[PDB]
JSON list of C-alpha atoms in Angstrom, two decimals:
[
{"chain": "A", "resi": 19, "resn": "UNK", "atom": "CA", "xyz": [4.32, -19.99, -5.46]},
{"chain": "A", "resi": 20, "resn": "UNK", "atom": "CA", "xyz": [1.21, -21.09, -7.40]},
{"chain": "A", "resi": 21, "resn": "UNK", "atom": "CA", "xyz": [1.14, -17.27, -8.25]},
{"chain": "A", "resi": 22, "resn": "UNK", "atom": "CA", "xyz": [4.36, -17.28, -10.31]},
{"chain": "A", "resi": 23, "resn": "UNK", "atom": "CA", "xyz": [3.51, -20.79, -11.98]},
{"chain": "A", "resi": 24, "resn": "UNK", "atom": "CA", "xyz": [0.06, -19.98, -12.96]},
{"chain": "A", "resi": 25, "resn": "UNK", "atom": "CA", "xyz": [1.13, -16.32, -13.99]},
{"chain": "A", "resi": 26, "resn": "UNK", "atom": "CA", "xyz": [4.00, -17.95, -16.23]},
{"chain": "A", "resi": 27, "resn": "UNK", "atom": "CA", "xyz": [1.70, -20.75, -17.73]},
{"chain": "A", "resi": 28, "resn": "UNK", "atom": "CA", "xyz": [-1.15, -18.55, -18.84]},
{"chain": "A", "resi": 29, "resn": "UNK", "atom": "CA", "xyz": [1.25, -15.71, -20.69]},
{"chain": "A", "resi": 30, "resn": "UNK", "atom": "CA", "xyz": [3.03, -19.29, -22.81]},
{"chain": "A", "resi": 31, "resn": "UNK", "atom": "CA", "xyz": [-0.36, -20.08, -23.16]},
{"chain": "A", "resi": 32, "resn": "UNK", "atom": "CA", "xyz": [-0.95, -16.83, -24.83]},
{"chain": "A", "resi": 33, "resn": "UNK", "atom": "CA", "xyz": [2.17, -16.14, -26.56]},
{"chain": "A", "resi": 34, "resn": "UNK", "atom": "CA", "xyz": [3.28, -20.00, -27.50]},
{"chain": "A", "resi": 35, "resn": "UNK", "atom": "CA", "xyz": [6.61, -18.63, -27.33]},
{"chain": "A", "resi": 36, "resn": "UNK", "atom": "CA", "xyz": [8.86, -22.09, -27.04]},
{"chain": "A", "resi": 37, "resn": "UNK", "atom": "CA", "xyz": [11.69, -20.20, -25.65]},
{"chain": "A", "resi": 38, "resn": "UNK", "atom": "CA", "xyz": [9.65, -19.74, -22.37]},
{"chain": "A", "resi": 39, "resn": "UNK", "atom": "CA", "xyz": [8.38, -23.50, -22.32]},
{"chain": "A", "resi": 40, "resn": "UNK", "atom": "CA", "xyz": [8.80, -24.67, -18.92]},
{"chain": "A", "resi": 41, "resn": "UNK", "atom": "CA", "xyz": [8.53, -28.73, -17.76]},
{"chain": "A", "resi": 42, "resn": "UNK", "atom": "CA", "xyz": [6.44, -27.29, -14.48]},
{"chain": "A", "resi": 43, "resn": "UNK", "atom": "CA", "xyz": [3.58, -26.45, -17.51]},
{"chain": "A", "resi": 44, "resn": "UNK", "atom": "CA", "xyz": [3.24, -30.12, -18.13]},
{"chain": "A", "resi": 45, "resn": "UNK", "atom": "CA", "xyz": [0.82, -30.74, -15.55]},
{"chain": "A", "resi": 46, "resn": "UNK", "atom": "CA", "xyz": [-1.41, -27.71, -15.71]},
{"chain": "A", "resi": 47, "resn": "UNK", "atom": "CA", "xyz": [-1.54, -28.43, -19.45]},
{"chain": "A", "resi": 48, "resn": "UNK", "atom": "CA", "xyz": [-3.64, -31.93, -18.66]},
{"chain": "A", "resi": 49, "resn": "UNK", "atom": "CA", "xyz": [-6.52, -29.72, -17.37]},
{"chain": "A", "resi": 50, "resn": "UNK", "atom": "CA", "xyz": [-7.26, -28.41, -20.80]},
{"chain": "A", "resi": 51, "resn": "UNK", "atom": "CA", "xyz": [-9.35, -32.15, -21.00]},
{"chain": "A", "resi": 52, "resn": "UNK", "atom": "CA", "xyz": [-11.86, -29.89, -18.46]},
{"chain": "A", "resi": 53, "resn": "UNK", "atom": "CA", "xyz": [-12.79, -27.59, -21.07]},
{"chain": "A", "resi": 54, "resn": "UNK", "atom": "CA", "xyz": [-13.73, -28.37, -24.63]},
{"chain": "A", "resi": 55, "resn": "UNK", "atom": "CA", "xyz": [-12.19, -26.12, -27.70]},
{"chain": "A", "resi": 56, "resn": "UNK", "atom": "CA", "xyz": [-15.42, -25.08, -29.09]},
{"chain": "A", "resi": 57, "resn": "UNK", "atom": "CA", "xyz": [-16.99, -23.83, -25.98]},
{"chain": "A", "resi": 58, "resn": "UNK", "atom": "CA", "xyz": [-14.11, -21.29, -26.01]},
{"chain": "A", "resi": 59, "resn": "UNK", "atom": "CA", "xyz": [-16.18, -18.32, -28.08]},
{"chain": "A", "resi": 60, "resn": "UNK", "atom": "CA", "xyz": [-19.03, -18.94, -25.51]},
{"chain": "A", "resi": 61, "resn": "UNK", "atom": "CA", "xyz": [-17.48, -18.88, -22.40]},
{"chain": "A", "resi": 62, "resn": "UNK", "atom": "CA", "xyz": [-15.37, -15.80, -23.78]},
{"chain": "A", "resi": 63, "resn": "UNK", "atom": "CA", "xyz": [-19.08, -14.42, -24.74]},
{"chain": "A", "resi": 64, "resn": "UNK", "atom": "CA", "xyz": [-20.18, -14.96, -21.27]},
{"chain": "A", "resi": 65, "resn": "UNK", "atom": "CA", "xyz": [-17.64, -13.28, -19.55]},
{"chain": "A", "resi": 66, "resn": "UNK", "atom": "CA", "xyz": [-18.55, -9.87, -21.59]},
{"chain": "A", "resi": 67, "resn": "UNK", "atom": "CA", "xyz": [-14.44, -9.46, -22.22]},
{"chain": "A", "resi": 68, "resn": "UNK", "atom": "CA", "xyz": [-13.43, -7.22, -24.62]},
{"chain": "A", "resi": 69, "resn": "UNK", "atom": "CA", "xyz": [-9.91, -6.35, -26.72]},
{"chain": "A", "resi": 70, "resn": "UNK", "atom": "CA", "xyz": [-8.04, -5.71, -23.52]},
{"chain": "A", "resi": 71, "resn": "UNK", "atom": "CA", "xyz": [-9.72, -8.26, -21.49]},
{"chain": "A", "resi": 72, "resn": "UNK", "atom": "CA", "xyz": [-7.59, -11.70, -19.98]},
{"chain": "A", "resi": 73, "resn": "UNK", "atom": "CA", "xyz": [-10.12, -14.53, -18.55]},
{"chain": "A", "resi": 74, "resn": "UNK", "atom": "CA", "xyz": [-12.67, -12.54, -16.70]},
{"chain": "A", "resi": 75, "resn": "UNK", "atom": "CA", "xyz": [-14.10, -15.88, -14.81]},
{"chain": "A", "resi": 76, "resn": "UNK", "atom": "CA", "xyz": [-15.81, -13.82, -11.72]},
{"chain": "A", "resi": 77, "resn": "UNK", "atom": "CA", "xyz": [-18.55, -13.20, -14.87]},
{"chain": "A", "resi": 78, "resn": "UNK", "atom": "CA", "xyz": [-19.37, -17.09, -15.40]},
{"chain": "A", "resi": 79, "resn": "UNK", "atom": "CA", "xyz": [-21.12, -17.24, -11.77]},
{"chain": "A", "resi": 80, "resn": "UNK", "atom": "CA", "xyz": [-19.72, -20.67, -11.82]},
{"chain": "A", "resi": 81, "resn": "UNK", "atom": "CA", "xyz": [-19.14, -21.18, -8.22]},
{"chain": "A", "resi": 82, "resn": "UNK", "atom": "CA", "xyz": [-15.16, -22.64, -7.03]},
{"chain": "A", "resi": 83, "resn": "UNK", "atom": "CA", "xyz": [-16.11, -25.62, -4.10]},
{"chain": "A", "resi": 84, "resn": "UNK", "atom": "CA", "xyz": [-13.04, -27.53, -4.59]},
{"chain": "A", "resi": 85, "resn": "UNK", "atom": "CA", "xyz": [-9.91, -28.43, -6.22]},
{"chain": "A", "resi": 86, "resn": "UNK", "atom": "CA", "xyz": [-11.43, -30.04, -9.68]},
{"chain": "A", "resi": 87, "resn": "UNK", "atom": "CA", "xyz": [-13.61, -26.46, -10.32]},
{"chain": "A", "resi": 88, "resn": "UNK", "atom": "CA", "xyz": [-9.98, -24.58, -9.61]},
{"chain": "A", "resi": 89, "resn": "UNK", "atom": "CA", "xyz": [-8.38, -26.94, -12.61]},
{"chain": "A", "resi": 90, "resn": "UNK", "atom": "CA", "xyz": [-11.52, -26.01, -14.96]},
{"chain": "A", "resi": 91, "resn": "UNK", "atom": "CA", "xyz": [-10.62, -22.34, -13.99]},
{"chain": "A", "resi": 92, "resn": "UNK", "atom": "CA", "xyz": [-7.53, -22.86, -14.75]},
{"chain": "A", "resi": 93, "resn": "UNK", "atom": "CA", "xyz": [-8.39, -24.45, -18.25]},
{"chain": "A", "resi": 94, "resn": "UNK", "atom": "CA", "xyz": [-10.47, -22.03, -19.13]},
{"chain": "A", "resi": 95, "resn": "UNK", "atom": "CA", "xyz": [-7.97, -19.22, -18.44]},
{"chain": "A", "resi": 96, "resn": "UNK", "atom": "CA", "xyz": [-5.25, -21.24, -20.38]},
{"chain": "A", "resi": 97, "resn": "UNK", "atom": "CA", "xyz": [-7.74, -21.80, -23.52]},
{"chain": "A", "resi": 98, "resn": "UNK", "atom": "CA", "xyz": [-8.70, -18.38, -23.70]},
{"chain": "A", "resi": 99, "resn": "UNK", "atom": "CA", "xyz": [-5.68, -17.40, -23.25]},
{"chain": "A", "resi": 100, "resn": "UNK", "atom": "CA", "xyz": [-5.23, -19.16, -26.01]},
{"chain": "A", "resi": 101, "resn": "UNK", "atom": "CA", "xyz": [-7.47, -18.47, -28.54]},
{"chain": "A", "resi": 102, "resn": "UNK", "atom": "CA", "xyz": [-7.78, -14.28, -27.87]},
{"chain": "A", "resi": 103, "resn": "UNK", "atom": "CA", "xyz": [-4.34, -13.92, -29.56]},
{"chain": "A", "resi": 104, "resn": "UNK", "atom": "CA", "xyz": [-0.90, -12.31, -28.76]},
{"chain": "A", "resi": 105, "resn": "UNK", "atom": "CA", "xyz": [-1.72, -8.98, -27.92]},
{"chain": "A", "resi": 106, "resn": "UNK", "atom": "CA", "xyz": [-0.07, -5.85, -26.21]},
{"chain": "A", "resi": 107, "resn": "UNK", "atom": "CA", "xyz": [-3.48, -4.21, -24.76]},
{"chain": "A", "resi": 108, "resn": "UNK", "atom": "CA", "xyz": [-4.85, -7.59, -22.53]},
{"chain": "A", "resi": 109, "resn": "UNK", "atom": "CA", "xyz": [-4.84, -6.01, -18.72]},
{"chain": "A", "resi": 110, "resn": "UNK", "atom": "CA", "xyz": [-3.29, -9.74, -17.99]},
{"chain": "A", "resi": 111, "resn": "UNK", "atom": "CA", "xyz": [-3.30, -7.85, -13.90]},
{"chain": "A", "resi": 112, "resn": "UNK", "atom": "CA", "xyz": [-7.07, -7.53, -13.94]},
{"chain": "A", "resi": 113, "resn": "UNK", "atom": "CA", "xyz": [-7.24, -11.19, -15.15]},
{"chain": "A", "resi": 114, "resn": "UNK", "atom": "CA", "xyz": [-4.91, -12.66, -12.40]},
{"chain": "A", "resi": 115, "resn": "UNK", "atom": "CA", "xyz": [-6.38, -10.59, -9.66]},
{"chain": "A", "resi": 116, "resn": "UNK", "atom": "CA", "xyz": [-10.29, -11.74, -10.53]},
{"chain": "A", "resi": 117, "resn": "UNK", "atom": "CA", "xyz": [-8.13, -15.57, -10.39]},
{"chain": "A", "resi": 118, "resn": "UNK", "atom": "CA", "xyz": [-6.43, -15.61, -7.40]},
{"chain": "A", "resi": 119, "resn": "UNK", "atom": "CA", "xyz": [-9.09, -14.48, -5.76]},
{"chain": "A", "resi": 120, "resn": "UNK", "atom": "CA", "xyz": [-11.20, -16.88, -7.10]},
{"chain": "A", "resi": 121, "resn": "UNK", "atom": "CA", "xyz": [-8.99, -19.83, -6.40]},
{"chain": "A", "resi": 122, "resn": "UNK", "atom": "CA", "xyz": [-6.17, -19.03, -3.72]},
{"chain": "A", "resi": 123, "resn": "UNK", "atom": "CA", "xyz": [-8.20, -20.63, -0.86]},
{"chain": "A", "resi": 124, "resn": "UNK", "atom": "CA", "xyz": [-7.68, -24.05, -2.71]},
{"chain": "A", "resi": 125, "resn": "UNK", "atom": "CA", "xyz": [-3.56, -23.56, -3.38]},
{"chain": "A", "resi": 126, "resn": "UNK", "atom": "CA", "xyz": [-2.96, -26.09, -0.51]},
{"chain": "A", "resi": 127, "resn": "UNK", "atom": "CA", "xyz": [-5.60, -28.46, -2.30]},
{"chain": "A", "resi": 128, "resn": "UNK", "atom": "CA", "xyz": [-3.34, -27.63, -5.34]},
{"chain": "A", "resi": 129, "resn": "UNK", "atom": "CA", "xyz": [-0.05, -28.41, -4.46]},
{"chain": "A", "resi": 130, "resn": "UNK", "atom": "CA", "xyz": [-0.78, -31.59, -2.92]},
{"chain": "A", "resi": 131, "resn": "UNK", "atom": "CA", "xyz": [-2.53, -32.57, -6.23]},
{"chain": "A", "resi": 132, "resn": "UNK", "atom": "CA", "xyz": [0.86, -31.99, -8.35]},
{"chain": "A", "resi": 133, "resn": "UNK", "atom": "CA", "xyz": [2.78, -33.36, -6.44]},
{"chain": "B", "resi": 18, "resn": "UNK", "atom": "CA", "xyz": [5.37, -7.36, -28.32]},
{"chain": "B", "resi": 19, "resn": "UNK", "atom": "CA", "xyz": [3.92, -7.17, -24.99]},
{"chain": "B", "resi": 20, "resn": "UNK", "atom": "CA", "xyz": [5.95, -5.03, -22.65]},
{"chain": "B", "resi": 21, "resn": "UNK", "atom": "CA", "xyz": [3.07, -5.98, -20.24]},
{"chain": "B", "resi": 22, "resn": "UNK", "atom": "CA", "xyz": [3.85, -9.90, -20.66]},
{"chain": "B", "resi": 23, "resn": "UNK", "atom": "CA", "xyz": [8.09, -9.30, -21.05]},
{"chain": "B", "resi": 24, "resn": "UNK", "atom": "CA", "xyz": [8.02, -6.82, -17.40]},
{"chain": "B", "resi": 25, "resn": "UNK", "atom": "CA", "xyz": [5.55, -9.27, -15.77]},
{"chain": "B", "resi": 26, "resn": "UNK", "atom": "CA", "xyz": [8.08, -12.32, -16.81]},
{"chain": "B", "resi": 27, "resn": "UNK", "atom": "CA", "xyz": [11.58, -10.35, -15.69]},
{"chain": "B", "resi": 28, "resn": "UNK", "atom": "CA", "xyz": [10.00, -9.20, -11.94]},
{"chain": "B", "resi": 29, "resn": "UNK", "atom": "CA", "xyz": [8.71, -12.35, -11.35]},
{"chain": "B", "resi": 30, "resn": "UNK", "atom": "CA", "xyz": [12.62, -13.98, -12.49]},
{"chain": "B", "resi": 31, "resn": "UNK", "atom": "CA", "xyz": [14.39, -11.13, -10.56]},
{"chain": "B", "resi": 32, "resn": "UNK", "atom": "CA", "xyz": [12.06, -12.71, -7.13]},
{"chain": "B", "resi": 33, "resn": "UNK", "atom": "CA", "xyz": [13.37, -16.52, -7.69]},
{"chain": "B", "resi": 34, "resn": "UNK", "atom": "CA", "xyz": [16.39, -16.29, -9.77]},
{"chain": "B", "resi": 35, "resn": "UNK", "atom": "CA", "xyz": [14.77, -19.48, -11.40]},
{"chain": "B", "resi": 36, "resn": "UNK", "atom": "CA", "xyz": [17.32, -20.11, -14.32]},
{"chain": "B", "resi": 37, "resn": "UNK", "atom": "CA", "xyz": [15.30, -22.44, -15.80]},
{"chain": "B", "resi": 38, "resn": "UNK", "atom": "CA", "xyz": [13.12, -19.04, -16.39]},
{"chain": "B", "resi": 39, "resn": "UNK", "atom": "CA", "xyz": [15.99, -16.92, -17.52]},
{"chain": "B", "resi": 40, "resn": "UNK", "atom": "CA", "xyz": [15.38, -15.48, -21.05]},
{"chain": "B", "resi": 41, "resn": "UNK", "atom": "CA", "xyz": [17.78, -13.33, -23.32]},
{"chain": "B", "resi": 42, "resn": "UNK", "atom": "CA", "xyz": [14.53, -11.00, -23.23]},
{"chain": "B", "resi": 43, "resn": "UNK", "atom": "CA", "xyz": [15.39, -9.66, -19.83]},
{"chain": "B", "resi": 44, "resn": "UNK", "atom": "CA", "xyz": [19.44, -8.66, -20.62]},
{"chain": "B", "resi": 45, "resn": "UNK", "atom": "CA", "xyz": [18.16, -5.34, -21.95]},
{"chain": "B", "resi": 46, "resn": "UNK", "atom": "CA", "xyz": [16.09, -4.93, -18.63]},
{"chain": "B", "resi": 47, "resn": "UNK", "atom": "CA", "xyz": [19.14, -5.94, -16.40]},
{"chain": "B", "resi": 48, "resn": "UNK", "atom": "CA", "xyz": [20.91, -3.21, -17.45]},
{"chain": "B", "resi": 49, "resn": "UNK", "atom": "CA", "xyz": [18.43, -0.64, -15.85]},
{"chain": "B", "resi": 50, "resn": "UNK", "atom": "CA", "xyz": [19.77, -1.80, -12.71]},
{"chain": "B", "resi": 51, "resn": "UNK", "atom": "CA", "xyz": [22.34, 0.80, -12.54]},
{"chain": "B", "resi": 52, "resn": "UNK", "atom": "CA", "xyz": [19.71, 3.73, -12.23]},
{"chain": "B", "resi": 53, "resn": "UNK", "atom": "CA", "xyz": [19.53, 2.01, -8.38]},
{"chain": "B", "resi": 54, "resn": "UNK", "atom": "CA", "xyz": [21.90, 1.46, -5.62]},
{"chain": "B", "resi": 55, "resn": "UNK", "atom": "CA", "xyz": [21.47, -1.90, -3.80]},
{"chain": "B", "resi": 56, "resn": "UNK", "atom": "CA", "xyz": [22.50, -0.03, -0.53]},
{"chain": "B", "resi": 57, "resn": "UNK", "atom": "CA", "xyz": [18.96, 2.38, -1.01]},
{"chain": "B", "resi": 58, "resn": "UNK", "atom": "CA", "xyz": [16.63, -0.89, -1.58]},
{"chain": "B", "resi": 59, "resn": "UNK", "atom": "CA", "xyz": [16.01, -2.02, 2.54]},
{"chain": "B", "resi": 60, "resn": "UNK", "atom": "CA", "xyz": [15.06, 2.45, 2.53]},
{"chain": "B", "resi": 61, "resn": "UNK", "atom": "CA", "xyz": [13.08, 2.38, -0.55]},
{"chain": "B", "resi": 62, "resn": "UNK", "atom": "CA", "xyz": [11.18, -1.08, 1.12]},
{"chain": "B", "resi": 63, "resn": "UNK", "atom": "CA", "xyz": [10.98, 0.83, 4.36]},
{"chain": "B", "resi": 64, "resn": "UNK", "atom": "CA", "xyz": [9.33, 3.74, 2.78]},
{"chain": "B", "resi": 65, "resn": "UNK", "atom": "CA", "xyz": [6.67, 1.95, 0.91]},
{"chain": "B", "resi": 66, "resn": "UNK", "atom": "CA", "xyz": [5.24, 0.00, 4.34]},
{"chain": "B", "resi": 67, "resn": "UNK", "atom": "CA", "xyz": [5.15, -3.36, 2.60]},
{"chain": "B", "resi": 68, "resn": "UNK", "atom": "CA", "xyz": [4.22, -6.43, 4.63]},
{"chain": "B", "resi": 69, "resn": "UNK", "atom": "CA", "xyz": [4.61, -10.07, 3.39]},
{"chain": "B", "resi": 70, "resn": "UNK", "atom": "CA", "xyz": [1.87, -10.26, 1.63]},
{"chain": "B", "resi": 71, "resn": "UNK", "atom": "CA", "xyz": [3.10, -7.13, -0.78]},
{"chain": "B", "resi": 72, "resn": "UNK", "atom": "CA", "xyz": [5.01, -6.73, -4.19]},
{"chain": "B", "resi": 73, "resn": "UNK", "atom": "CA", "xyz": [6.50, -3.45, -4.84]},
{"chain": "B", "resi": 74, "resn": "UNK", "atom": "CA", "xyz": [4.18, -0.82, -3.99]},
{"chain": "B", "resi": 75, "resn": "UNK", "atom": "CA", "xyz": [5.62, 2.11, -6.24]},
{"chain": "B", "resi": 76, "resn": "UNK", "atom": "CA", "xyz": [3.09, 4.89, -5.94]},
{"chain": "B", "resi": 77, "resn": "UNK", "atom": "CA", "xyz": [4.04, 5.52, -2.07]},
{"chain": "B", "resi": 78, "resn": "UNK", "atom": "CA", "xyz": [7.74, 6.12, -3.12]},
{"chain": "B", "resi": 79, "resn": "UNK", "atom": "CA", "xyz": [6.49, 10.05, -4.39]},
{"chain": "B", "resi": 80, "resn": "UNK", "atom": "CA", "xyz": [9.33, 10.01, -7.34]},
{"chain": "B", "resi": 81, "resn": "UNK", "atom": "CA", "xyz": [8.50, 11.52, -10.63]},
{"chain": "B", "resi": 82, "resn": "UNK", "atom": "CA", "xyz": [7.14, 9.26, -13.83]},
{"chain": "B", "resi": 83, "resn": "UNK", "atom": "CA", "xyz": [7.57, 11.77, -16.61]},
{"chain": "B", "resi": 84, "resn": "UNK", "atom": "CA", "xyz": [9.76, 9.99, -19.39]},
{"chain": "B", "resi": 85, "resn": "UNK", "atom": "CA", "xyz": [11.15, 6.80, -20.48]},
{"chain": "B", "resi": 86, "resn": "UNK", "atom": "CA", "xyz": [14.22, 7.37, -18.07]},
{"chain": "B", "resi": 87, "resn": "UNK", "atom": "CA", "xyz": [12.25, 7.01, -14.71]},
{"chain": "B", "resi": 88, "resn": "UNK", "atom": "CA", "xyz": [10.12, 4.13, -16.41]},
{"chain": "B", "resi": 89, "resn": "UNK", "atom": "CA", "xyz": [13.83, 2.69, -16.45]},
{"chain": "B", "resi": 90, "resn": "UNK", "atom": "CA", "xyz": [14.25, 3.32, -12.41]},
{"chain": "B", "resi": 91, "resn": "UNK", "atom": "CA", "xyz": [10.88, 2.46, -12.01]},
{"chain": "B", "resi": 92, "resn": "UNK", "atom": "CA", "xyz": [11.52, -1.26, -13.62]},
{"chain": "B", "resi": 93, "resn": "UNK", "atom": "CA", "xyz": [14.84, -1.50, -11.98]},
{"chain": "B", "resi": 94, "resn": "UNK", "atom": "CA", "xyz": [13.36, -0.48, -8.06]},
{"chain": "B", "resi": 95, "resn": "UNK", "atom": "CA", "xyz": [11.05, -3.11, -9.76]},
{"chain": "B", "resi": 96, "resn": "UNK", "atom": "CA", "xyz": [13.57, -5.78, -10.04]},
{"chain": "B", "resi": 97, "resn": "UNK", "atom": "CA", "xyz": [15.84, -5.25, -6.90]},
{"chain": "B", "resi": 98, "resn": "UNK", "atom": "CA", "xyz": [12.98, -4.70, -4.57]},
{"chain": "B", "resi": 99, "resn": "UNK", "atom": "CA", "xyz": [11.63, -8.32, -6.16]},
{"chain": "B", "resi": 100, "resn": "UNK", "atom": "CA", "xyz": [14.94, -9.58, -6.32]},
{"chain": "B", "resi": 101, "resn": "UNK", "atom": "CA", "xyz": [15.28, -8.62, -1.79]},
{"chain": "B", "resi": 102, "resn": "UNK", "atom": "CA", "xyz": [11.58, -9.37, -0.30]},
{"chain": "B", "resi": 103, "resn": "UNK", "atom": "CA", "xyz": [12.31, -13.04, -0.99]},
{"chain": "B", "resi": 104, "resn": "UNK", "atom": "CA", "xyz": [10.71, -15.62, -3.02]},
{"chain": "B", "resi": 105, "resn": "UNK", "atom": "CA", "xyz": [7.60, -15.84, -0.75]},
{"chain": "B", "resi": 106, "resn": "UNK", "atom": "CA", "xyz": [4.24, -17.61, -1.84]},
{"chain": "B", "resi": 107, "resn": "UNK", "atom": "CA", "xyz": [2.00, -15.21, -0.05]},
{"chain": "B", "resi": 108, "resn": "UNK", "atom": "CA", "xyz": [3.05, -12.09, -2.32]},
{"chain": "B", "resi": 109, "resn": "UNK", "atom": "CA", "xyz": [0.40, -10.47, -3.78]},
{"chain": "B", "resi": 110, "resn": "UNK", "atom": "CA", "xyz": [1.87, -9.85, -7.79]},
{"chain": "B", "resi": 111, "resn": "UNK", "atom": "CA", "xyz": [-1.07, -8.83, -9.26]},
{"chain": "B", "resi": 112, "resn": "UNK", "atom": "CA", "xyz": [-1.93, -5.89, -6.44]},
{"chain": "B", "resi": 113, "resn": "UNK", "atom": "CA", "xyz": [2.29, -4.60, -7.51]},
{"chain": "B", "resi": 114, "resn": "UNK", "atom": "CA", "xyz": [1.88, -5.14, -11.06]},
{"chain": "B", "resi": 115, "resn": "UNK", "atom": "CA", "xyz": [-1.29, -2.87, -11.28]},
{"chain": "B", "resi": 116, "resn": "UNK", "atom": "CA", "xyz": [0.32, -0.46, -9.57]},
{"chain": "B", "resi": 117, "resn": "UNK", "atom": "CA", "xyz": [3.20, -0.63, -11.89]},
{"chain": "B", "resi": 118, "resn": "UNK", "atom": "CA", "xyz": [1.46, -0.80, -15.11]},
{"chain": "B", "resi": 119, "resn": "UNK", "atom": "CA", "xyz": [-1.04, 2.30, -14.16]},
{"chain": "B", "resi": 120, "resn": "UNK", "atom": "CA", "xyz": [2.26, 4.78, -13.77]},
{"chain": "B", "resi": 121, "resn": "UNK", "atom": "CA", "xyz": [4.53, 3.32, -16.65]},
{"chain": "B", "resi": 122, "resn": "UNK", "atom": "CA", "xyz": [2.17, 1.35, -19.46]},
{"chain": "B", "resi": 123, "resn": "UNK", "atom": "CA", "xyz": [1.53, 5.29, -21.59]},
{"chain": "B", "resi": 124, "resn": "UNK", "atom": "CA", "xyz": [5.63, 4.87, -22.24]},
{"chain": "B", "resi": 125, "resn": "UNK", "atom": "CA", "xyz": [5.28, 1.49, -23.06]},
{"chain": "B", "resi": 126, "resn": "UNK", "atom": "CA", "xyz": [5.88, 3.36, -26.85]},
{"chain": "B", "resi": 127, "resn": "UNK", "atom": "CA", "xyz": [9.05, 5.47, -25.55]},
{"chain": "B", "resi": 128, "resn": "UNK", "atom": "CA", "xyz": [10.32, 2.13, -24.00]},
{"chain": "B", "resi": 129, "resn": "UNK", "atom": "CA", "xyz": [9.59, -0.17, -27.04]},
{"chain": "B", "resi": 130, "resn": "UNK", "atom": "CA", "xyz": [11.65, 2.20, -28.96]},
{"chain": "B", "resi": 131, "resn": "UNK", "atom": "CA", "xyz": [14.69, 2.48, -26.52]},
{"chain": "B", "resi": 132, "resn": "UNK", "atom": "CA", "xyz": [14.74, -1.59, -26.30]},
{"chain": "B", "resi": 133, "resn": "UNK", "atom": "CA", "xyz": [14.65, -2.01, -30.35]}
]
């Protein structure tokens, strides 16, 4: 289930908690060279997201076409998630809803990819 | 703490049984499971109408959410209906844990305070 894996890599992402490090992150952590640190603020900006916002990527009108746009989505949801800080009020369901929509199509595309 | 992030985690590891994503986080949550029969699951599952494509749908069961105590069932139905649909890529977790969070996140304080 890319569900579960991307659900569970985005939360370490956002908590860094090393006791829920998993060796299935390893790949999905290589698509952080998609995005670049100090575009963060912006693309955060861009997507409007306040305090109890997760990545709200519907909002960048960038369109998904194929596997590599999926990997920046994914990138940009693991930076973010990142950078907006361990925090009990982020609607993470909101977040992975506006994602899988976004970005289920492409799973098959996915899978093959890692492995 | 998240309760949001530590329920999400704990479903999700009551569907696979993954214990490479077991965490001493969830032995406080295991517990709950005694508020729910396993023989009253395949009626609860019945009664909700789920297809493949579902999570727990709690808000067609028509019990009560007034105190900590049913978030405890609520998390626990969580957790053995996960544990019985099967781990199944086409199930829609974010649809179930909306639906969760909506009836249980104003006792996320009451439950915070029952776990510490």
């Amino acid at each position: 289930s890319m569900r579960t894996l991307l659900i569970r890599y985005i939360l370490w992402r956002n908590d860094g908690d090393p006791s829920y490090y998993n060796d299935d992150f390893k790949k999905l952590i290589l698509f952080d060279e998609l995005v670049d640190d100090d575009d963060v603020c912006t693309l955060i900006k861009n997507m409007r997201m306040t305090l109890s916002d997760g990545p709200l990527l519907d909002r960048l009108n960038q369109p998904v076409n194929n596997v590599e746009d999926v990997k920046r989505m994914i990138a940009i949801s693991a930076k973010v998630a990142r950078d907006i800080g361990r925090r009990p009020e982020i609607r993470w369901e909101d977040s992975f809803t506006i994602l899988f929509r976004m970005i289920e199509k492409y799973f098959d595309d996915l899978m093959t990819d890692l492995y």
